[PDB]
Each structure stands twice: as structure tokens, then as C-alpha cells.
Amino acid sequence: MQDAITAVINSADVQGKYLDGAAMDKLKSYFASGELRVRAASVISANAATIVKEAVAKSLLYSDVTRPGGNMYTTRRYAACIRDLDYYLRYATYAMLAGDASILDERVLNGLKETYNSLGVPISSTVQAIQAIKEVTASLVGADAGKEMGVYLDYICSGLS
Amino acid sequence: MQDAITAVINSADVQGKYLDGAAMDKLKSYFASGELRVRAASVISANAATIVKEAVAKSLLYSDVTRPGGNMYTTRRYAACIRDLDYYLRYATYAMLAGDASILDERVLNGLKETYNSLGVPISSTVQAIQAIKEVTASLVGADAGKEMGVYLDYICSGLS
Amino acid sequence: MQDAITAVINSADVQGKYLDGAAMDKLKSYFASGELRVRAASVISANAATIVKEAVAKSLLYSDVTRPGGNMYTTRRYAACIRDLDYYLRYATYAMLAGDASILDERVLNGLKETYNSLGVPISSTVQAIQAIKEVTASLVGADAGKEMGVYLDYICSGLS
Amino acid sequence: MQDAITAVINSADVQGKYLDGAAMDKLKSYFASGELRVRAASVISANAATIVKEAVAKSLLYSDVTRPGGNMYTTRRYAACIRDLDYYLRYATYAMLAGDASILDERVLNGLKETYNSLGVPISSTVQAIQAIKEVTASLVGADAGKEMGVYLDYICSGLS
Amino acid sequence: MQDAITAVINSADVQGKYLDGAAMDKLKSYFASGELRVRAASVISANAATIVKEAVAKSLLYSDVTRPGGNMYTTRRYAACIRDLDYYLRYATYAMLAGDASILDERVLNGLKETYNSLGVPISSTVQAIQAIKEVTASLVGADAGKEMGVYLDYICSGLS
Amino acid sequence: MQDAITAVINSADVQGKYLDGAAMDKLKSYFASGELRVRAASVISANAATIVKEAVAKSLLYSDVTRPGGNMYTTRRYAACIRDLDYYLRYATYAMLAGDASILDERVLNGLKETYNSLGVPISSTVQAIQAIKEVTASLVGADAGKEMGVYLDYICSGLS
Amino acid sequence: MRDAVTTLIKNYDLTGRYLDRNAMDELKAYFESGSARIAAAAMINANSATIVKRAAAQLFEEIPELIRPSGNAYTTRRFSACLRDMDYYLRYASYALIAADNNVLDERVLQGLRETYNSLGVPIGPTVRGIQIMKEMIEAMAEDSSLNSTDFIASPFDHMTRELSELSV
Amino acid sequence: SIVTKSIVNADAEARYLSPGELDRIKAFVTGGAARLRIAETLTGSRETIVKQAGDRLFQKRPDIVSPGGNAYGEEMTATCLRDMDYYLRLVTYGVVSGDVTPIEEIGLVGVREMYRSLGTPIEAVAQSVREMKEVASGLMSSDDAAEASAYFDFVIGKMS
Amino acid sequence: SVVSQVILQADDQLRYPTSGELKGIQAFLTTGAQRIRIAETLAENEKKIVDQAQKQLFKKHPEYRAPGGNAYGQRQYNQCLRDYGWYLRLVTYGVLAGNKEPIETTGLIGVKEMYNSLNVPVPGMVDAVTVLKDAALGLLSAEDANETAPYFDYIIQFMS
Amino acid sequence: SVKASGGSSLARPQLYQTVPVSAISQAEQQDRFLEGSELNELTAYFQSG
Amino acid sequence: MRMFRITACVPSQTRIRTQRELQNTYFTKLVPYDNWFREQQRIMKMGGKIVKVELATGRPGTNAGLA
Amino acid sequence: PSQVAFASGDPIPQNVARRTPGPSLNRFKEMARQVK
């Protein structure tokens, strides 16, 4: 994967140039945001289960999905949905820490659409659930870190779509 | 699509030989069932709209599906749901006449799951609606013809699963 | 697509350079081989349908592939197989004239294995037919033109395999 | 994989008869060339690192491929390209000693296009490198064995194309 | 393992003769006791967790072992002790159902003694816990099957010591 | 491992000396006997099943081990024993071709003695089977090859003892 | 896999329905025919290898080229491969007859057969022809035997033919 | 299904069905009539069984229905009763199939995780199933009650 | 036995035996009486059964006793009869156990190479097993023979 | 029919072995150039060919 | 990380049925503590015998500082 | 030197027998014989 530091480093390296002032400003910005990123990561790791629970209750429960004939009917299938949401939240936190949506692209999205298309998982409904997770995490962590987390949550949603 | 007759002839021709006694046995069985099949088909064709009306009244009407925020809320989506129920009834009639669900596999269950997934169609609600259609059709056509039709309706339901 | 001349031109272009000595050498080699290529192409154009005919005769006639139940049994299936062989012959001829195999990838090989997999077609049997096509072409084309045509047909076989 | 011997026997058996008139011609030619081809293989094995050295010097070194932003830029990618060159030389030796490129098909060309397109390896640069390898080997082994190895090297190049 | 029923067959095969009255009486006794054994096994399977909890409360809880400085102090070691006790209960149930302690000898007394010695596990405390297991299970199942199960539990204790 | 040549090389190398006259004539003797070793190994491989069959026939057929109660009675145990004898024959052939006995300790004698003790295998009967293999192979190959084979067979039996 | 009971249970669970009268009737029908299913399974177990041998020893005469050169049973290796495939078919037909469901027949036989056989160049027409010959032999043997019900035996082989065959029309 | 388990055990060894597994299948088919009798009793009594078990649970464990409990409120009580109905239906499936595989696959895989997510006491759910067992066993003969007790106890064990 | 199979499956799944497995064990325990009866009838009527089986098999296969066969010596003819006795003993063991495990672990696994190492024809021995099963079925009663037959059939399967 | 395909890629089981195939297979599997052993195999077999 | 030096013999139960080459069933290796339970279960369920076990690494009774 | 010219040299053309009806058409072959 790649964080902000490795991203700027690779951008300089690919063209072979040393790190200049314009590049160094980006690393300074990342270092400025690092404290907020760590605080948000700690909060989300503390409230990992609660966030997924609230999002599921606010989006999926009592809808068509959980009722018989839906893709959240059996207990195993419900547990799988919860596990998918756990993946989304955890990897969104990873991407927020790294300041770069590369781990999301190479470990959460490269083939996830194909897997859902094969399994019949409703991508629109899972996008709605991720939106619910975005809202819950934003409320829990604040406007700035909430927006940063929502950036990568929307990244995952766009990748799924 | 393959009916019973074309299925028997296909099994014969992929073997290269003429229809032996067993082929004529299967054909005579199908022709024996043919009169009941045609009676059921004609009754269903006459009572096409009424069956869908009864099924919608039994399952979807005055529910969250048809209330605002439900996928059967807007007039266009209501008409689309009605047309889908008409598809289910007509292709059930086709499968009844042909003695097979090959047409269901080719046309009805061909991309239907992810089609409804992309559109946002409630799978459990549509399955319950198809079950209501099956119940109404069985009541209107008879125990034996109702069961025979319900075989194909349940095939469509399990495919939607 | 791209012939050998186009390949050298594109390499020089992408490096942003004028045609140096090595590019001149490659172009001279292609110009040396050009008349023989034209002769072979004219011969194969004269004997296009025939070569496919003896290819299938040495390969697929009176065989399980053409028996009832095979993938070439029906008249329409046999016509489809003949059409595939006609494309393969014509595109091998085009590749031989252009001195490059890029046309095969552009036209034939870019989705053809997925095509046959969705069609249920036997890749082993089609490779056998193309292999027979190799010798049937070599007989009418010569020795070194035969080697070139066999190279392009082997590219086709590798793409299918 | 397969060799000329097994190809000849397979043809003989599929035709159902003994090695009558031309199977033995090809077999005697193969056995006659066997000793010279073995000596060439031994020379190539001894000079494996060298041949890659002159080939990379002739084709890839001091180019945009090696410069920053090229697919042979980093140390790991340089080592990977060198290892691939050794792979090409080794499988050229295998094809030379077996009299057939079926080893190239099953072990080299089975997923070569997929891996290279997925990674981003410049096909033209690799082809130029393999041509340089062929020329170096021909110089180091003789025109005869040089051409004998060059046929398989050119088979690999065409497969890359 | 080695069933009670298969014990007579194994003995007869060892002496190279057939089951006789001297062993067929034991076979009949096992057949008669089979219903009681199955009843006890069903009861123990239903009340597996409760028996382990009761024995832990009655034997080890509020003792030096569970207090700091004891081998059952840390949460991980407590969980390991609970898992070991559950395995003891399940394998004692298996021995009860099979009418023999051969499975206890094989899958229980294989390396358990020396593993406990290496880890410093209290042998006396383990024996006390197994005795509590025996008493609780005898109370839960009845004296008739309680004695039979306690036979295998005594076998386990003697093997441990 | 090592062979005759490797062993003499190591013996010279431990003192760090060039190949003296003793090493020279030992290599001469090994080279002279290499043809005999190759012939005997070829014969043994050609008739390999027959040696084991005859050795068991004259060693343990109609015997106490084959009798129930012994370690040779059941069909599974008999197959395991014959497999062990066949592998011992193959390793003896490897040793005879090598000219050095270190291969037996390398691959076979590492733990066969203690594993047979753990499994309760009769070592005396194993040695007798090895000896019978000695006479069978000596008769089949010749006295000159027989003694050479029997050297490694005796090494195997002594190691098992 | 899923036998008839399991597939009916899955179908009713799909709509979240309790077992109704029709479900009870189908369950009763399967449970009453279970005796004949077990009897046919016992018969086929007793005569399995001989039935497959007879099936091949009729199929290669129907299609003589499968044992002639370039046919896909030429070698003894090829011949044993063909026999192994036919034994596979018989075993899964036995399994399907006892299960009263073709789900096992699809999960463990048909789900990749065309892929594998095309990868190996093995014809897919003579395969189903041999399957049907096996079914005919099985039906004749069961009819000779004291089997009151034997119509179910044709179901697994017919499903094999339908799924593994080419869609001629 | 016992048929499923025996066929799977046979296929895992690549043999045809063994005599012991055929014996088990024959016993299962013979007992199918009693299985259907038990299942039909359960489905006919589904309303009464669920109602009485829910009443017993709401009496023994008033915490779950008191304010601040998971089942508090009319809708939450209805959903608790619906889950009881789900588990009764799964019990009927297991009764018909002669094993607990349908119950496992539908409503006993990940049930702990799902009820943790929903905030429900798994011990309370197990208590509800135990009361369903008692009420149902009160509605049938001795042997049938013992037969259904196996499925009920399996659900209890999987939940606690 | 079936008890061993059930307990092995439960151990493999890391769980207690299920309801269906327990009921199967109960049914086998019930049928243990007829299992015993199989035991005494076969054990006390082996000699006529084995003699008839050997005579019929060697009449069908006039090679092993004939020149170019396998049982020239009386030591070899006695060995063939001993193999019959051992096979029928194993069949009785398996019937008493309820499943095929004693036969599998005593005289089934590896028996093909067992008799390849001795040059005894596997088709000849499978024909011998067929005739032995026929004799046992003829000498046993109809339901008794039906119960005993599947084990001999499975032995025939594993042989060839 | 089946509702999904894995992909019917070609397969090349070895019908039988020849000495060059054996030596080349050993080298290919071991990821090596044909060493002295395989080279001697090839040389002797070619001479006796 | 704690290590269990275990000596055990695990004969194969399917070699004559699968035609697989023989292996040295006996082994005296070091197993991590976390995998030791599963390894003991696998060895006992494969019919193997645990001849010896020792705690090669890690002080017995240690509460913290395991890995 | 030129002895190594196995592949680079002119390939040794082989012979492929044209496919012919087999025993699967014995009935039709006999029909042709009698229609002679």
C-alpha cells in the first residue's frame, strides 16, 4: 500500500527528481493532519462494533433484505454482512491513517464488485449501509475527521458501484 | 426454450438414434397432461389481469412497499411491478405448457437477480408477491393445475433466491 | 494493428527519434522478405476454402467432434466451425503479409477464449484443427512461407490454449 | 511438454500405423542434430550470465527503459528483467533440445501475455532484448546453432507480439 | 478409537477365532446398556457448559490456583483450563457412549501428562477438577450412568497421575 | 550424501591434499566396476517386484507374522510391510549404483529402527526379510553383483538391529 | 448437497413458510418410495462393476472408433480412464437415487464436465450415450428384480444426459 | 438430512453407499412417519406454542421486556415473538429432516454475532427456546416429546 | 461400529454427536440381537458354506487347481479355503459391528496388491467372494440374508 | 445446463515419456540449465538414436 | 515465544490407498505454543503417539512477556 | 556445423492420412455394397 509520504516519494522517484519545496509542503500537510488522523483512528477502533451496529440498524434492519427471500435472511448471511461492514470500516480507518486510498484500492476493491455480482449481494444496499457508517462515524469523530473518513468510505462505495 | 417434446427429441438426437419406446412413453405422458395444461393456460389467459390484481391486493397493497419510500410507491414503479407480475404469470403459463422451466432459465431468470439488485427491487417482497400469484392461480385453476403451475412459480422464486 | 514497418516506426516515434541504423536494418529485412510474403498471400487467397477443407478432412471429419452430440454435429454448428476456420486462415494470412502478430490480438485473440468457454467449444479440438491447417497451408505455400504461416497459426493456437 | 520424438510417435499412432517413411526422416534429422544442439546448450549454460550481460548492454541499457519512469528503473525491476532474460534463454535451450516449442507454449506462453500486460512490461523493449540475446548467443555459439536457438527465440518474440 | 463392541471383535481377530459366549455375553451387556449410555450422552451434551461451570465453581474458583501466583490466574490460562475441562467432558462422554476408555487412552492420555509437567500444570488440581466433573455429571445423569461415566473419569485421572 | 568418488575426494580434502596414487587407483577400481553396477541395477529395476515377491515367499509366507496376532496378519499391514521391503530394495540399488553406503543412513536408517520399535515391529523378522532379499537379489543378479548388493543390505540390517 | 427433503425445506424456507399440506404430501411420497430407492441402490451396489463393464462393452460397439486409433479410449490408460468416468457416473447415479434429488448430480458431476472434457479433448456425446446405456441396463436389471417402483431410476441418468449433452435444438 | 450425511460420507471415501449407511437410511425412512406426525403437531400448534413460550419467557425474565430491555416496546416484543416463530419453524425443518442441519444452516451459524450486533442476550434467547421445548413437549406423547427434545436441546446448546 | 463412526464424526466436527446420530446408535443397539444371530449362524454353518463355495468357484475356474494355476499343492488349496474362512469371519465381524470398519481394517484395504504380490487373480477372488455370498444367502433366511448381503456386496465392490 | 463456467483452458497430460522429455522436465522443474547429468543423458541417447 | 520440543510418531493411515511415497513419520521438532494445541489434536486424531514433550522456550508460569 | 540445422533448416514434411469412414458406418458400407 501507499500512504501520503510514500505517495509523494514515489511521485518524485518515478521522474527521478529530488524532493522539492512543493513536494515537501504536502508532507508538511500530512504531518499536520497526523495527530487528527491518529485521534480519529483511536476513536473508531474503540467504537468499531458500535458504528457497524448503528449503521445496520439505521439502514438495513426491517427492510426487504433481512426478511425471508432477502440477502440478509439467514443468520450466517447476516453475520457475513456484518463482517463486510467491519472490513469497510477497518480499511477506511487504515486509508484515513495513511492519507491515501491505495490500500483500499488494492485490498478492498480489486475484485469486490465481481464477488458481489457473483454472490448476488445488493451493491446499492451495501452502498447505503456504507453511507450510514459514514454518517455514524462522522457524528462520532467530528466534522473534520468525519469528512476525511467519509472520503474513503465514498471511495469504497464508488469502487463497488 | 425446450418443452417436453423438444427435450425428448434433443435427448434422442444427441444420441443419434430414432425415438425408441421410452421416447414415445414420455411423449404420450406429455400429451395426456396436455389437455389439463391447455385448460389451465386458457383460464389463466382469460383471468390474467384479475390474478395480478388479487396478488397485489394480498401481498403488496397497503404496505411499506407501496407507501412513500417504498420501491412500489411511484406510479411508474407501480406499473412496472404490475408488468413484472404479468411477466411472471405469462412465463409460468409458458413453462406449464412446455412442461419445463427452460424458458424461465433463458428469459425470466436470465440476469434477473442483478437486474433487480441494480434497480433496487425488493427481492423478498417480489418473492412474496410471486407466492401470492401462485396461491391465487391455484385457487382459480384447481388443485392439480394449481400445483403444476406452482412448480414453475416456485422455480422462479428459488431462482430469485 | 501494426505491420513490421509500423512497429519500427512506432518504436522510433515513442522514443522521439529519427530512423537510425538499426531501424533501417529491420526495414531492409522486411523489404527483403516482402515479395515472398506477397507470393504466399496470393497463393493462400487462391486456395483459401480448399485448405480449410482438407484441414478439417485430416482433422475433424468422421470423428466424435462431428458425430451427433458433438459440437460440430448440426449443419449450423458445422457452418460455425467452418466460419471460425475461415477467420483463422484469413487473419493468419493478414498477419503474414504484415509481418506482425499484433493483428491477431487486436481482432481474434482479445476475447476468443472467453467466447469459446461461454460457447462450450473444445479448445483442444479447435487447436487440432488449426494444427492440421498448418500443414495444409505449408503444402500449398512452400517451406519458409510455410514456416511463417505456421508461426502465426501457432500464435493462434497459443492464444486459444 | 513434448519433444520431436513424442510428436512423431503421436502422429504415427493417431494415424494408426508404424513410423513408415517420414517419421524416421524427421527422427534421424533430430538425432543427427542432437549432439551439436547439446554442445550449443552446454555453451549457453556456461555463458548464461554473460549472454544476458551483452544483451542488456546492447538493447536496454542507457535508455528510457532504464531511466527513471521506466519499467526497468528500480533495482528490483532490473533484477526481474534479468531473471526473465535467463528464463527466455533457458526455455530456448529446452525447446532446442526437445525439437519443439510446446515447452514454450505450456511453460512460457501460457500466461506470458497476461502477466506482462497486467504488470506493464514494455512488449517492444522485451522483444528488442530477446533479439539482442539471440544475436549474442548466435555470435557466441556459431551461425548454425545461433539460428537453431534463434527459431525458438523468435517464437517467444512472436508470442510476445 | 476402539469401541467396547469392537473390542470383542478385535480380540477374536487377535486370537484368530470367532466371538463366543464368553465375549458374546459382554456384547449383550453392552447392547442392553446402550440405551442408558445414549441417554447419558444426550443429557451431557445438552448440559455440557453447565457441568463445566459447576465443577469449576466447586473445585478451583476462590482458591490459590485462581488467585494471583497460581497457574489459573491470568485470563488466558483460565480460558485454557476451561477449554481443557470441556475437552475432558466431551471425551469422557465419548468413552461413555462407546463403552470403553480406549479413546481416552489414545486422544487424551497421549502427551497430556508430559505436556502438563512441562507447563507446570498442577496435577493434583487437575485431578480435583476431574473429580468435580465426575460428581457433577453423576448428579446430573443419575447414579446408574454416573458410576459408568466415573469409571472413565477415574481412568483419565489415573492416566494423568 | 556421497559416493565412492565423492568419498575419496572428501578423504583427500580433509587433509587438503591433491589426488594421490591411492585415490587414483580407488577411482580406477570404481570406474572399472561401474559397468557391473549399472548392469546389476538395471536387472534389479527390471525385475524389482519379483525379488520382493520371492523373498517374502521364502521368508514370511505361511509364517507366524502372517498368522493373526503378528504384525503381518492384516492385508493393510501386509501391504505396508511389502512397501517397506520394496523401498529397502530400491535404496539398496541406489547404494550399489553409488558405491557408497552413506545414502542408507541418510534416507533410511535415520529413524526406522526407533519407529519400528514404537510401532512394535519385529526387528528380527525385519532382518530375516532383509537377508532373504539378499539371497534373492544375489541369485537374480549374480555372485559378483550379489556380494556388492549384500554389503548394503547387511548395512541396512545392522542399522535396523 | 441436497436430497429431496433438503430441497423442499430450502424452498419453503425461501418464502419463510411452515410445512403445509402439499409439503407434507411430498415428504410422505419420498418417505414411502424410500424403500424402493434403497432396494435399487442395493441392487446397483451389488452389480455396479459388471454393469459398467457391460455398458462399455456395448458402447464401444455402438461407436467403434472410440477404441480405434485417434479415439479417446485407445490406450489401456485411456480405456481405464473411460471406465473410471463411467464408474463415477454410476456411483453418482446411485447417490442421486437414494437422495431423490439431482442437486448432488449437479454439484459433484455436471458443474464442470464440459470444461474438463473439452480441456482433455474427450467427446461429450459418447459419454452421455454410455450414460444412457448404463441407465437402460439398470432399468432392465431392476425390472428383472422384484422392484415394485423403478420409474425413479431413469431420473438421474436423464438429468445427466440433459445437463451434459449439447443443446441440439 | 441423514440421507445427505450418509451420501456425503460415502462420497468422501469414493465408495458406493456402505451397508451401515444404508441401514441408517432405512431407519430414517421408516421413522419418517413419526417425524411428520411430530412436525405436523408442531406446525399446527405454532401459534399456541409461540404464544405460551413467549408468555413464560416474559414472566421468567421480565428484564428483557422491562424498559431498557431489548424486547421492550410493542414492536420489540413482536419481533422477539417473530424470532421465536423462526426458531420453531427451523425446529420443524430439523424434525422433518431427521437432523439439525437445516437449523444450523439457517438459524444457528453466526447467531451469536447477529444477536451481539442486535444487542440481545443469547442466554435469554436460549431460555425462550427451552420454554418452547417445554410447551411443545407438553403437546405430544412421551416418545415424540423426547424426539423433539433433541432439536430443541441442539438449539439451546448452539445459543448458549 | 456405527458408534465408532458417530463418535469419530463428532470428534472431527469438535462437537457432541447429533440427534440423528444418537438415534442411529439406538437403532443399531436394538438390532444387536439379529446381529448376534448372524454371528452364531455363520460361525456354526461355515464349513458346508465354505465347501460349497470352494467347489463352485473351482468348477467355474478350472485353472488354479488345474495345471498353470495357483493351488497345485495341498498347502495352497488349504490356503484358499483358509482365505474363505478368514473372509467369512471378517463378514461376521462386520455384521456384528454394524458397519464395514472391521472388514476394511482387516481384509479390505490393500488386498488388491495383497493378492497381486501372491499372483492370486483378483477377478478370481471376487468370483469366489460372489459364490461365497450366494452360499451364505441360500443358507440364511430371507430377511436374514437380505441383512447380511450388503456387506458381501461391499466386499465384492472393494475387491473389484 | 450449468449456470457458470470455470474456463475450459487446455490441458496436456503426458501420454508417455522419452529420455529428452525426462531430462528437460527435470531441468525445467528444478529451475536450472541442463547440467552435466541431463547433458550426458541427452548425448548418450542422441548417439544411440 | 514459547516453544514445545515434541517427539512424536504419526504413521500415515492412507498410504496404501493413495500410493504416496513413504515419509519419515517420526519427528522431534519445535512447535509454537499457540499452534501446540491444534498440533497435539491433529497428531492424536491421526493415530500418532506423542513420545515426549518439553518446554524448550519460555519460563513456566510466566504471566507477561510471552511473545 | 550444418548438422545442427534441425529446425532452422527446411522442415521434414509429414504425411497425414485423409480421414475415412470407420466401423461406425458399417451398416452404410454394407448398404453401399448391396446397392452396387
Ligand SMILES: *[C@@H](C)[C@H]1/C(=C/c2[nH]c(/C=C3N=C(/C=C4\NC(=O)C(CC)=C4C)C(C)=C\3CCC(=O)O)c(CCC(=O)O)c2C)NC(=O)[C@@H]1C
Ligand atoms: C560507482 C557508482 C560504481 C560504478 C557505477 C556504474 N553503474 C553503471 C550502470 C548502471 N548503474 C545502474 C544502477 C541503478 N539504477 C537504478 O535505477 C538504481 C536505483 C536508483 C540503481 C542502483 C544501472 C541500472 C545501470 C545500467 C546503465 C543504465 O543506467 O542504463 C555503470 C556502467 C556499466 C557499463 O558497463 O555500462 C557504472 C560504471 N562503477 C564502478 O566501478 C563503481 C564501483
Ligand SMILES: *[C@@H](C)[C@H]1/C(=C/c2[nH]c(/C=C3N=C(/C=C4\NC(=O)C(CC)=C4C)C(C)=C\3CCC(=O)O)c(CCC(=O)O)c2C)NC(=O)[C@@H]1C
Ligand atoms: C526485461 C525482461 C523486461 C522487464 C522485466 C520485468 N519482469 C517483471 C516481473 C515478472 N516477470 C515475470 C515473468 C515470468 N516468470 C516466470 O516464471 C516465467 C516463465 C519462467 C515468466 C515469463 C513474472 C512472473 C513477474 C512477476 C513475478 C516475479 O517476480 O517473477 C518485472 C517487474 C515488474 C514490477 O514492477 O513488479 C520487470 C521489470 N522489464 C523491462 O523493462 C524489460 C522490457
Ligand SMILES: *[C@@H](C)[C@H]1/C(=C/c2[nH]c(/C=C3N=C(/C=C4\NC(=O)C(CC)=C4C)C(C)=C\3CCC(=O)O)c(CCC(=O)O)c2C)NC(=O)[C@@H]1C
Ligand atoms: C461486578 C459489577 C462485575 C462482576 C464481577 C464478578 N467477578 C466474579 C468472579 C470472578 N472474576 C474472575 C476474574 C479474574 N480472575 C483473575 O485472576 C483475572 C485475571 C486478570 C480475572 C479477570 C474470576 C476468575 C472469578 C471467579 C472466582 C475466582 O477468581 O476464584 C464474580 C462472581 C462470580 C460467581 O458467580 O461466582 C462477579 C460478580 N460480575 C458482573 O456481572 C459485573 C460486570
Ligand SMILES: *[C@H](C)[C@H]1/C(=C/c2[nH]c(/C=C3N=C(/C=C4\NC(=O)C(CC)=C4C)C(C)=C\3CCC(=O)O)c(CCC(=O)O)c2C)NC(=O)[C@@H]1C
Ligand atoms: C379517488 C379520487 C379515486 C379512487 C382512489 C383509490 N385508490 C386506491 C388505491 C391506490 N391508489 C394508489 C395510487 C397512487 N400511489 C402513489 O404513490 C401515487 C403517485 C404518487 C398514486 C396515484 C395506489 C398505489 C393504491 C394501492 C393501495 C395502497 O395505497 O396500498 C383505492 C383503493 C383500491 C382498493 O380496492 O384497495 C381507491 C378507492 N377511487 C375512485 O373511485 C376515485 C376516482
Ligand SMILES: *[C@H](C)[C@H]1/C(=C/c2[nH]c(/C=C3N=C(/C=C4\NC(=O)C(CC)=C4C)C(C)=C\3CCC(=O)O)c(CCC(=O)O)c2C)NC(=O)[C@@H]1C
Ligand atoms: C447423399 C444423398 C449425397 C452425398 C453425401 C455426402 N455427405 C458427405 C459428408 C457429410 N455429410 C454431412 C452432413 C450432415 N451431418 C449432420 O450431422 C447433418 C444433420 C444430422 C448433416 C446434413 C457431414 C457433416 C459430412 C462430413 C463427413 C463426416 O461427418 O465425417 C459425403 C462425404 C464427404 C467426404 O469428404 O467424405 C458425401 C458423399 N453426396 C452426394 O453426391 C449425394 C447427393
Ligand SMILES: *[C@H](C)[C@H]1/C(=C/c2[nH]c(/C=C3N=C(/C=C4\NC(=O)C(CC)=C4C)C(C)=C\3CCC(=O)O)c(CCC(=O)O)c2C)NC(=O)[C@@H]1C
Ligand atoms: C482362494 C479363495 C484364492 C487363492 C488363495 C491363495 N492365497 C494365498 C496366500 C495368502 N493369502 C493370504 C490371505 C490374507 N491376508 C490377509 O491379510 C487377509 C485378510 C485378513 C487374508 C485372508 C495370505 C496372508 C497369504 C500369504 C501368507 C499365507 O498364506 O500365510 C495363496 C498362495 C499362493 C502361492 O503360494 O503362490 C493362494 C493360492 N488362490 C486362488 O486361486 C483363489 C482365488
Ligand SMILES: *[C@H](C)[C@H]1/C(=C/c2[nH]c(/C=C3N=C(/C=C4\NC(=O)C(CC)=C4C)C(C)=C\3CCC(=O)O)c(CCC(=O)O)c2C)NC(=O)[C@@H]1C
Ligand atoms: C487374446 C488372445 C488376444 C486379444 C484379444 C482381444 N482384445 C480385446 C480388447 C482389447 N485389447 C486391447 C489392446 C491394447 N491396449 C493397448 O494399450 C495396446 C498396446 C499395449 C493394445 C494392443 C484393448 C485396449 C481392448 C479393449 C478395447 C477394444 O475393444 O479393443 C478383446 C475384446 C474383449 C471384449 O470384447 O470385451 C479381445 C477378444 N488381445 C490380446 O492382446 C491377445 C493377443
Ligand SMILES: *[C@H](C)[C@H]1/C(=C/c2[nH]c(/C=C3N=C(/C=C4\NC(=O)C(CC)=C4C)C(C)=C\3CCC(=O)O)c(CCC(=O)O)c2C)NC(=O)[C@@H]1C
Ligand atoms: C426473543 C426471544 C428475543 C428478542 C428478539 C429480537 N430480535 C430482534 C431483531 C432481529 N432478530 C433477527 C433474527 C433473525 N432473522 C432471521 O431471519 C433469523 C434466521 C432465520 C433470525 C434468527 C433479525 C435479523 C433482527 C433484525 C430486525 C429485522 O427483522 O430486520 C429484536 C429487535 C431489535 C431492535 O431493537 O431492532 C428483538 C427484540 N429480544 C429479546 O430480548 C429476546 C431474547
Ligand SMILES: *[C@H](C)[C@H]1/C(=C/c2[nH]c(/C=C3N=C(/C=C4\NC(=O)C(CC)=C4C)C(C)=C\3CCC(=O)O)c(CCC(=O)O)c2C)NC(=O)[C@@H]1C
Ligand atoms: C515389513 C518389512 C516388516 C514390518 C514392518 C512394518 N512397518 C510398519 C509401518 C511403517 N513402516 C514405515 C516405513 C518407513 N518409514 C520411513 O521413514 C521410511 C524410510 C524410507 C520407511 C521405509 C512407516 C512410515 C510406517 C508407518 C505407516 C506409514 O507408512 O505412514 C508396519 C505397520 C504396523 C501396523 O500394524 O500399523 C509394519 C508391520 N513388520 C513385520 O513383521 C515385517 C518383518
Ligand SMILES: *[C@H](C)[C@H]1/C(=C/c2[nH]c(/C=C3N=C(/C=C4\NC(=O)C(CC)=C4C)C(C)=C\3CCC(=O)O)c(CCC(=O)O)c2C)NC(=O)[C@@H]1C
Ligand atoms: C484446567 C483443568 C487446568 C489448567 C489448564 C491449562 N491448560 C493450559 C494449556 C494447555 N492445555 C493443553 C491441553 C490439551 N491439549 C490437547 O490436545 C488435549 C486433549 C483434550 C489437552 C488436554 C495444551 C496442549 C495447552 C497448551 C496451549 C495450546 O494452545 O497449545 C494452560 C495455560 C498454560 C500457560 O499459559 O502457560 C492452563 C492454565 N490450569 C489449571 O490450573 C487447571 C488445573
